[PDB]
Coordinates of N, CA and C and ligand atoms in Angstrom, one line a residue:
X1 N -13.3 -21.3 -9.7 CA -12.4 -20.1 -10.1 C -11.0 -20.2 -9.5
X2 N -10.0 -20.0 -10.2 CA -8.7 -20.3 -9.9 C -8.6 -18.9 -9.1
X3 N -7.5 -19.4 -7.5 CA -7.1 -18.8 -6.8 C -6.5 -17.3 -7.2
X4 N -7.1 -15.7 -6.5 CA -6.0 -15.5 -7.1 C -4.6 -15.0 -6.4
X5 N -4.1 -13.7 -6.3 CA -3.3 -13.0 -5.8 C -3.2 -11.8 -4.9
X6 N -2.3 -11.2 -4.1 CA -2.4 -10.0 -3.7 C -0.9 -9.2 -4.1
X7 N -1.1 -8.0 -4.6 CA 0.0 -6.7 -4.9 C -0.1 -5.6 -3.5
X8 N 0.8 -6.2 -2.5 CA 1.2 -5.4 -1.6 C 1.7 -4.0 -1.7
X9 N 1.8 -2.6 -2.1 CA 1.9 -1.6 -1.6 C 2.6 -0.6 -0.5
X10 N 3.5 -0.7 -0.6 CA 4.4 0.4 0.9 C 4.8 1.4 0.6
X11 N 4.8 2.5 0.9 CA 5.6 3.5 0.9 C 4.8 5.0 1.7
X12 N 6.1 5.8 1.7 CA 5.7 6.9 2.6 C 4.1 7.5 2.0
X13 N 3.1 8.1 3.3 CA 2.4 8.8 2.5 C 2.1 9.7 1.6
X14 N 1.5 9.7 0.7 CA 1.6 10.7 -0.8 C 2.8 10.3 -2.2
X15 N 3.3 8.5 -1.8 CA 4.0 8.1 -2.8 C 3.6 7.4 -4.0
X16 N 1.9 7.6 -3.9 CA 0.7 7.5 -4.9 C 0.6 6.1 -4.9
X17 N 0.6 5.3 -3.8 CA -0.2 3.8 -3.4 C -1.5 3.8 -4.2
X18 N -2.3 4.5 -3.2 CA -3.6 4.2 -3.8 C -4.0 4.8 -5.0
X19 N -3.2 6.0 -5.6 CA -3.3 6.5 -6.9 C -3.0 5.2 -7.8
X20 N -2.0 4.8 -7.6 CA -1.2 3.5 -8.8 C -2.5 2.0 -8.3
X21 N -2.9 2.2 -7.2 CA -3.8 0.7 -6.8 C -5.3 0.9 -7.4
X22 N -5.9 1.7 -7.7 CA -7.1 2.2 -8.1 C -6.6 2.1 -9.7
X23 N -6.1 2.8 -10.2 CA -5.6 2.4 -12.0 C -5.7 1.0 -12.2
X24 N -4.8 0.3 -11.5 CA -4.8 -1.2 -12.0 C -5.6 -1.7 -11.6
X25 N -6.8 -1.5 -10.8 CA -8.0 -2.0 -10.4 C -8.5 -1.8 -11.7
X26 N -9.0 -0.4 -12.2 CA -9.8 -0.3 -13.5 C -9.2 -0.9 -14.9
X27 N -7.9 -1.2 -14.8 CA -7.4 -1.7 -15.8 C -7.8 -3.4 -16.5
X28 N -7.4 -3.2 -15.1 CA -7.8 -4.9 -14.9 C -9.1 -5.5 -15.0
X29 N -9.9 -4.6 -14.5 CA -11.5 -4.7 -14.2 C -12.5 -4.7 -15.8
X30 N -11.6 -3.8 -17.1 CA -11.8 -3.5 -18.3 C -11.6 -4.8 -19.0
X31 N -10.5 -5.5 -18.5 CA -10.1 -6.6 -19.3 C -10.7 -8.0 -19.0
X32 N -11.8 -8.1 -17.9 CA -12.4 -9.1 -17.4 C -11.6 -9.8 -16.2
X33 N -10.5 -9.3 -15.8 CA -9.8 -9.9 -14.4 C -10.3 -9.3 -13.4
X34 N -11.1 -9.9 -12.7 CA -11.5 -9.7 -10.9 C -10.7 -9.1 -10.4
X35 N -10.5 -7.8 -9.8 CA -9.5 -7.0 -9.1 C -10.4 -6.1 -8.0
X36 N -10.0 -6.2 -6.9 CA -10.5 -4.9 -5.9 C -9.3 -4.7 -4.9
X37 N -9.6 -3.3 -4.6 CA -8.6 -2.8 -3.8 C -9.2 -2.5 -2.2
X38 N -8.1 -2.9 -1.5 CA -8.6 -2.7 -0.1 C -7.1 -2.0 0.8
X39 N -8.4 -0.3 0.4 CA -6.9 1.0 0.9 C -7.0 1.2 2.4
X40 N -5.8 1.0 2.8 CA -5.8 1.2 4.2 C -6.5 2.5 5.0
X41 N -6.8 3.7 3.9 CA -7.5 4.9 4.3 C -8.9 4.6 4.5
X42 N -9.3 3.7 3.7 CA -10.5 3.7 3.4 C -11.2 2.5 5.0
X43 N -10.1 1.5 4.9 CA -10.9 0.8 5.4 C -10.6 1.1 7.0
X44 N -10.2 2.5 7.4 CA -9.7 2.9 8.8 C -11.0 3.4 8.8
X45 N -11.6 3.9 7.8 CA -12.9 4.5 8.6 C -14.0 3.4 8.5
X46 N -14.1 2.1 8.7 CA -14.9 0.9 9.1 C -14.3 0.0 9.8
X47 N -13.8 -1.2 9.1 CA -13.0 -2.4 9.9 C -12.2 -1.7 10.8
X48 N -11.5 -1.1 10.1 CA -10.5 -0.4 11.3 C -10.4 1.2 12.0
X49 N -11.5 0.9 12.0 CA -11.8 2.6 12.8 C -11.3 2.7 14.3
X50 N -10.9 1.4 14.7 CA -10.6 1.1 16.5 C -9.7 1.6 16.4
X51 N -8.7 1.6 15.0 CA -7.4 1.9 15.2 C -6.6 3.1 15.0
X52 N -5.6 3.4 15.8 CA -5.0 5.0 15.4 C -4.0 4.4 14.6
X53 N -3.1 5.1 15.0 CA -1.7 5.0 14.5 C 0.2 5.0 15.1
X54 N -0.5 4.4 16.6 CA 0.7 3.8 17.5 C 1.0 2.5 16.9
X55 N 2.3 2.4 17.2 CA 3.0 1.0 16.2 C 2.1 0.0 16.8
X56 N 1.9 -0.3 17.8 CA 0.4 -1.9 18.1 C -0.7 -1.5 17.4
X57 N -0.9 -0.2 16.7 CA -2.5 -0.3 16.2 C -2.0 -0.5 14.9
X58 N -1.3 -0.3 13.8 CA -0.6 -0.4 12.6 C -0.1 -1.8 12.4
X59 N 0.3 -2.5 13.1 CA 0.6 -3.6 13.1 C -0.8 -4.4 12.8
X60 N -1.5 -4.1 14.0 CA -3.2 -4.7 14.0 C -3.8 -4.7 12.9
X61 N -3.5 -3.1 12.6 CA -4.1 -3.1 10.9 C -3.9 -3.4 9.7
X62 N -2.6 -3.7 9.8 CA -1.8 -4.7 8.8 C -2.2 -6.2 9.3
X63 N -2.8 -6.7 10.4 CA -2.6 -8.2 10.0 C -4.1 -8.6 9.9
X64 N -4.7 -7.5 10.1 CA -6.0 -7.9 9.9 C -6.4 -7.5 8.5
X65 N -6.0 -6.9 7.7 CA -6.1 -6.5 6.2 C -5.3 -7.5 5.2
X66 N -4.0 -8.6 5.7 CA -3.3 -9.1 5.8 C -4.6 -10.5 5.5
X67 N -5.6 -10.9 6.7 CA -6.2 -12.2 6.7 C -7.5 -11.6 5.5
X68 N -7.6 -10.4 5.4 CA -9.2 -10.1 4.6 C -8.6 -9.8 3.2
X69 N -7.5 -9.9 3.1 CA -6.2 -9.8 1.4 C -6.7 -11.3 1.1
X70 N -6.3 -12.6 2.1 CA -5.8 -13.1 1.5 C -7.4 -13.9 1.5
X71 N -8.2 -13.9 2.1 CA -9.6 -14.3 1.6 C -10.3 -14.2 0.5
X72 N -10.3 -12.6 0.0 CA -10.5 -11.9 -1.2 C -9.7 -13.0 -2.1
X73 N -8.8 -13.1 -2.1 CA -7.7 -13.7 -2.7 C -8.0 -15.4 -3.0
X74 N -8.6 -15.8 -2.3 CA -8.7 -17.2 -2.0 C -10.2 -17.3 -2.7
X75 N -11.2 -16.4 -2.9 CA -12.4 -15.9 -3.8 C -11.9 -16.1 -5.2
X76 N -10.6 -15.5 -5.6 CA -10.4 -15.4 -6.9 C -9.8 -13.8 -7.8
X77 N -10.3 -13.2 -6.6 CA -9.8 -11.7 -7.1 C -8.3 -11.6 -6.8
X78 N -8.2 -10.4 -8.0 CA -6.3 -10.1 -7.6 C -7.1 -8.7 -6.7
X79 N -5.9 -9.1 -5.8 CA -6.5 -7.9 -4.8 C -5.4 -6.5 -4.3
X80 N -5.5 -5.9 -4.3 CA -4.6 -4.2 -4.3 C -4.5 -3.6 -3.0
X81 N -3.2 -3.7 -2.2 CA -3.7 -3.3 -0.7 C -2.2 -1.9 -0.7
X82 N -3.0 -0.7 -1.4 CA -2.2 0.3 -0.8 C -2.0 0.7 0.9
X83 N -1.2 0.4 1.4 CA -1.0 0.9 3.1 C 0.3 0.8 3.1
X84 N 0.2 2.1 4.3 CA 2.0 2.9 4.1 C 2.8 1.4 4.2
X85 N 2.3 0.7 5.6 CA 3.3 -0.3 6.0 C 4.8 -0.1 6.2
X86 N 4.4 0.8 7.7 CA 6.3 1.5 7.3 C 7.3 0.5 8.1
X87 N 7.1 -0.4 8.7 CA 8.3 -1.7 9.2 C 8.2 -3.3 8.3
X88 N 9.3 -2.9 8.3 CA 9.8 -4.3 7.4 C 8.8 -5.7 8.5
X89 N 9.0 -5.9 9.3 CA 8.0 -6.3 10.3 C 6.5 -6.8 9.5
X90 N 5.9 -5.4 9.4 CA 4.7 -5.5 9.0 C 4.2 -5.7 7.7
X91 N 5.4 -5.7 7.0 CA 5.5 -6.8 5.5 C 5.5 -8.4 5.6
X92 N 6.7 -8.3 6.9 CA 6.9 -9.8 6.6 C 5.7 -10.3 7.4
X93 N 5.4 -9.9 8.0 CA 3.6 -10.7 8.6 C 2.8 -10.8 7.6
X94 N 2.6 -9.8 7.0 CA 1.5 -9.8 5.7 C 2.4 -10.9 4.8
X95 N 3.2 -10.8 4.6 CA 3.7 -12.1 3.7 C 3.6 -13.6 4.0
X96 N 4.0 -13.8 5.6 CA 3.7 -15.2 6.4 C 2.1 -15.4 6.1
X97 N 1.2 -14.7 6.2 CA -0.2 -14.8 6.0 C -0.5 -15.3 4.7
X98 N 0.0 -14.7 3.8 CA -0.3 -15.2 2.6 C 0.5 -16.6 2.2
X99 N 1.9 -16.7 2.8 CA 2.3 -18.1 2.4 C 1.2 -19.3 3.2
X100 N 1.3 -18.5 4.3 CA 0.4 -19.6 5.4 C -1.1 -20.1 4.7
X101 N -1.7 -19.2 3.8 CA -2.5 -19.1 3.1 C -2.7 -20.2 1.5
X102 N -1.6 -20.0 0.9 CA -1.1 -20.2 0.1 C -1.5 -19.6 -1.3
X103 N -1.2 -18.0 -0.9 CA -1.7 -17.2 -1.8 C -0.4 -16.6 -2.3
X104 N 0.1 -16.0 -2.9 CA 1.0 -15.6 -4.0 C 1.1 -14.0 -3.4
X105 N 2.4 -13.2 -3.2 CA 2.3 -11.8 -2.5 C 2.9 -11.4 -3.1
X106 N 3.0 -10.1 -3.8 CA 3.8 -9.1 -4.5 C 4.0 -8.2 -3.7
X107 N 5.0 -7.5 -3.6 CA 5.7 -6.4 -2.7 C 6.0 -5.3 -4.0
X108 N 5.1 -4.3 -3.7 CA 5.7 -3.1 -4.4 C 6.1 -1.8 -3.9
X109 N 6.8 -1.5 -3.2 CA 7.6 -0.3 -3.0 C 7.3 1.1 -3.5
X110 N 6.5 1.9 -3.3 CA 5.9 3.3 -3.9 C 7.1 4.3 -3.4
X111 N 8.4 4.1 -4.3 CA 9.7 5.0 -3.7 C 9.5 6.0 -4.6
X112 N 8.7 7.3 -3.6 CA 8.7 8.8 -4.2 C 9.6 9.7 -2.5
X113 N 10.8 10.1 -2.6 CA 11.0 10.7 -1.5 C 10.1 11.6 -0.8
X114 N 10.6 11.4 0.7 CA 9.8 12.1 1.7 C 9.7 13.8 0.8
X115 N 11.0 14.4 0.2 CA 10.3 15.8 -0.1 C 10.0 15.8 -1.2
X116 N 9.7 15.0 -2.4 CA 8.4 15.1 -3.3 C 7.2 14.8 -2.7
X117 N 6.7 14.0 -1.7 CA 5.8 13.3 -0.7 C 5.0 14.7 -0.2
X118 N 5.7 15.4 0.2 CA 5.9 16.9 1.2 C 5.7 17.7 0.1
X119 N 6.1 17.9 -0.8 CA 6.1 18.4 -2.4 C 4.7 18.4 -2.8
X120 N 4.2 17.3 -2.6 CA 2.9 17.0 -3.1 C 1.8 17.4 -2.3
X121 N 1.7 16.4 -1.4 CA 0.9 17.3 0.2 C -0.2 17.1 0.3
X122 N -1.2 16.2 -0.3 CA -2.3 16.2 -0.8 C -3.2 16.5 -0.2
X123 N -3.4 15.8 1.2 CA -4.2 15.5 2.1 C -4.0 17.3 3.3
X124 N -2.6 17.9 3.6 CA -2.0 18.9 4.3 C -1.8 18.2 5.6
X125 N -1.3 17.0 5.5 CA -1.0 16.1 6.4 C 0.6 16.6 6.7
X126 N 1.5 16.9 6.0 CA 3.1 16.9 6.0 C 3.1 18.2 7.0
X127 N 2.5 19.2 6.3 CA 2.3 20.2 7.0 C 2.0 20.6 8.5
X128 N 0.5 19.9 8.5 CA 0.2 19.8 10.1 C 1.0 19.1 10.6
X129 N 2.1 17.9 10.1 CA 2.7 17.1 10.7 C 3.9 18.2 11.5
X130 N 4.8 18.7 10.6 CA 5.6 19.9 10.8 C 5.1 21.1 11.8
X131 N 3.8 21.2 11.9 CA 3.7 22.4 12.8 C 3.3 21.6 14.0
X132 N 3.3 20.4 14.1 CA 3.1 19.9 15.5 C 1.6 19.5 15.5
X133 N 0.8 19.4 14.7 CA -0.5 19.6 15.3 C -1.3 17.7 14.8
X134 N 0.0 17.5 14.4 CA -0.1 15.7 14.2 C 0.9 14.7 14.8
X135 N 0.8 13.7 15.4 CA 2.3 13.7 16.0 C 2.3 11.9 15.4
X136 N 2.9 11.8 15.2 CA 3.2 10.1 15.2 C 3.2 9.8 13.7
X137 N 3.6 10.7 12.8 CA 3.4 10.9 11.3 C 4.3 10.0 10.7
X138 N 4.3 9.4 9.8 CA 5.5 8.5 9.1 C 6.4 9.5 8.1
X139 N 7.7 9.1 8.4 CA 8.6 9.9 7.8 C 9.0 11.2 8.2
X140 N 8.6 12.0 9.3 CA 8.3 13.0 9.7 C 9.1 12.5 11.5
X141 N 8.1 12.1 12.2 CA 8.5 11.4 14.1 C 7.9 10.6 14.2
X142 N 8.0 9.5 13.0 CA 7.4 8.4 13.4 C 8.0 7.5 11.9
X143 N 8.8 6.0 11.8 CA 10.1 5.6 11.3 C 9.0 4.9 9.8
X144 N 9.9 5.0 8.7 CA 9.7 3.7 7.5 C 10.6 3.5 7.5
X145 N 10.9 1.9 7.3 CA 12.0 1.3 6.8 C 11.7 0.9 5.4
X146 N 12.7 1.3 5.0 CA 12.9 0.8 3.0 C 12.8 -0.6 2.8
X147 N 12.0 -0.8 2.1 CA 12.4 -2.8 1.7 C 13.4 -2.5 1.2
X148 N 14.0 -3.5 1.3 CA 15.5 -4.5 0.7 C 15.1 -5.2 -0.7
X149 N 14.2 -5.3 -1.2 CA 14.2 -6.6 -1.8 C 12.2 -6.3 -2.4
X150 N 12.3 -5.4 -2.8 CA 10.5 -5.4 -3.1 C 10.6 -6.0 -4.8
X151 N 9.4 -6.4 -5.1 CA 9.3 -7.1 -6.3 C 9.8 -5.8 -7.9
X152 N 8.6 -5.0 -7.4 CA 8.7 -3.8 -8.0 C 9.1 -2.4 -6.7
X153 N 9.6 -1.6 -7.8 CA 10.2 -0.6 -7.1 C 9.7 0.7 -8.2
X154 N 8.3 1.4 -7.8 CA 7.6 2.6 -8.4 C 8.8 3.8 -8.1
X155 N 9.2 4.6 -9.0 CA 9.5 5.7 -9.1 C 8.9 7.0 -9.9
X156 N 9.1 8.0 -9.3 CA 8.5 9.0 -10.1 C 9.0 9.5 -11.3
X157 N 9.1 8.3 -12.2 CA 10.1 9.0 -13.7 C 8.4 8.5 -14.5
X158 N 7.5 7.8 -13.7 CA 6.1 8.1 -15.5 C 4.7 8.5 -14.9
X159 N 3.9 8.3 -15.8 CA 2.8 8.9 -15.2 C 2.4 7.6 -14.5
X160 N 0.9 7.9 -13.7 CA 0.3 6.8 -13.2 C -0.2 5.7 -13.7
X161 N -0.7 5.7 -14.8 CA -1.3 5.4 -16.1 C 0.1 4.0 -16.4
X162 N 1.2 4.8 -16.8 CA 2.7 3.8 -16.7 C 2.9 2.9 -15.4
X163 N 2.6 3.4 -14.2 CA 3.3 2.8 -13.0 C 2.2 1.6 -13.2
X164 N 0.5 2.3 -13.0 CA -0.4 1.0 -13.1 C 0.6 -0.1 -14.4
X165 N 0.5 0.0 -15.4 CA 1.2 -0.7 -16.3 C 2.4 -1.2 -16.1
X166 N 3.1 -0.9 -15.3 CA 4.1 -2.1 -14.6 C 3.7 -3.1 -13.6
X167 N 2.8 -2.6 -12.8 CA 2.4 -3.5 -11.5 C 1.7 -4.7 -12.7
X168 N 0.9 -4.6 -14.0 CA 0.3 -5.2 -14.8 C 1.4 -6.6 -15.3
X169 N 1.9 -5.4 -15.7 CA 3.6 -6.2 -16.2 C 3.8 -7.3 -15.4
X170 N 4.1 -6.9 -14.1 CA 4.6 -7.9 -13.0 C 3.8 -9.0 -13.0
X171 N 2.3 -8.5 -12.9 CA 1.5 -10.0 -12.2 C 1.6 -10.4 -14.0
X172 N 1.8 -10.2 -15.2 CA 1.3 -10.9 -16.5 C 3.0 -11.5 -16.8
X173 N 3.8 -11.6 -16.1 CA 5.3 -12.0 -16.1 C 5.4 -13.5 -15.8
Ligands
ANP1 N1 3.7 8.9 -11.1 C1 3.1 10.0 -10.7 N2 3.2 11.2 -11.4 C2 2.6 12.3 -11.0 N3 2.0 12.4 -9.8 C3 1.9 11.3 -9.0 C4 2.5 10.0 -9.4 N4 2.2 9.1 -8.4 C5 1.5 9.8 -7.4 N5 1.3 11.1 -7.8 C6 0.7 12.1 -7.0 O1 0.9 11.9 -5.6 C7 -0.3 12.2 -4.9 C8 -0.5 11.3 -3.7 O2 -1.0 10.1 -4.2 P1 -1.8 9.0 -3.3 O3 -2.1 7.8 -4.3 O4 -3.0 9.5 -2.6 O5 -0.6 8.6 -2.3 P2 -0.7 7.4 -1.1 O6 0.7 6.7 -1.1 O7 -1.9 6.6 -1.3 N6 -0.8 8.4 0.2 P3 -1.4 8.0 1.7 O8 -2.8 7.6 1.5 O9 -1.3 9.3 2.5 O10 -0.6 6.8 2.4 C9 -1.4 12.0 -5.9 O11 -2.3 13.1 -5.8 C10 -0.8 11.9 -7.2 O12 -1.3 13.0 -8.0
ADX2 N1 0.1 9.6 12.0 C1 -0.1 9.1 10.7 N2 0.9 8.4 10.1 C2 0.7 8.0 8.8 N3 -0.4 8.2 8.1 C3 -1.4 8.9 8.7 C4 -1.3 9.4 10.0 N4 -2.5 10.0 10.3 C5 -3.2 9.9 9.3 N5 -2.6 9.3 8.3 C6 -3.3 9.0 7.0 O1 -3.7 7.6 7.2 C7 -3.3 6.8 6.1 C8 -2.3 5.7 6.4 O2 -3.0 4.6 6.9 P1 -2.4 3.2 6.7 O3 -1.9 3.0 5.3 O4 -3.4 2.2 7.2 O5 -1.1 3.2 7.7 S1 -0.3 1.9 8.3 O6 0.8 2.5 8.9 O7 -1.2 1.3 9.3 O8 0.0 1.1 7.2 C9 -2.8 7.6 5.0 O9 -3.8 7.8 4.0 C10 -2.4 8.9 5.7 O10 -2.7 9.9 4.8
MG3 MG1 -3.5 6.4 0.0

């Protein structure tokens, strides 16, 4: 089975990562391409349950999702890793991983501003963030840095349905 890839994911939380990474999983999955996603929410409550969310634990959890990306990857599946990933830092690790690998990395950029993000609310994460009763929140008292240079760059002009269909775009380019 030919090698496959990973579609990296960053942005603030509630910029519909794992909404847009779950679409192109079933998209993909319809059409007979091996695709699984591995969401950084999901896998905090197993692999990475040790970890909070001080910059050494975030980092941790990026490079260890980083070596289990590019395994999956090395299996044959295209693989979907929604996580905020808020320092440039903890991209370019996940990136050295996969070159060191020799696996193929897309960077896509989930740019919905902090107050559509807040707008949206999903989880009432922004909120508790704001009343104090969460502290170390991203985008809120605790930093993202913007990529410079992401492959794709999701904005909130289509539905989800469209965004999956660009990430599609990208890897069928
Ligand atoms: N293109 C879009 N159009 C309309 N609504 C959207 C779009 N993208 C995302 N949303 C909404 O934004 C909400 C947050 O999406 P979600 O995919 O959970 O964000 P996330 O980046 O994974 N958040 P987090 O897990 O906290 O890092 C979802 O409930 C979607 O309904
Ligand atoms: N302090 C926090 N900062 C950011 N996200 C948080 C925080 N606490 C809980 N979360 C939730 O935890 C998830 C973010 O986890 P990751 O994507 O795994 O973060 S990362 O910074 O290490 O990449 C989101 O689903 C978010 O809703
Ligand atoms: Mg998510």
């Amino acid at each position: 089975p030919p090698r496959g890839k990973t579609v990296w994911f960053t942005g603030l939380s509630g910029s519909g990562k794992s909404s847009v990474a779950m679409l192109v999983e079933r998209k993909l999955l319809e059409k007979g391409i091996s695709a699984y996603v591995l969401d950084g929410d999901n896998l905090r409550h197993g692999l990475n349950a040790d970890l909070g969310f001080s910059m050494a634990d975030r980092a941790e959890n990026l490079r260890r999702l980083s070596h289990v990306a590019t395994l999956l990857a090395d299996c044959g599946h295209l693989v979907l890793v929604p996580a905020i990933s808020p320092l440039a830092e903890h991209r370019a690790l996940a990136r050295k991983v996969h070159a060191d690998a020799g696996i193929d990395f897309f960077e896509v950029f989930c740019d919905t501003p902090l107050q559509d993000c807040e707008r949206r609310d999903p989880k009432g994460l922004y909120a508790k963030a704001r009343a104090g009763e969460i502290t170390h929140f991203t985008g809120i008292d605790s930093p993202y840095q913007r990529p410079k240079n992401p492959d794709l760059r999701l904005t909130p002009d289509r539905s989800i349905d469209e965004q999956a269909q660009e990430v599609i775009d990208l890897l069928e380019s």
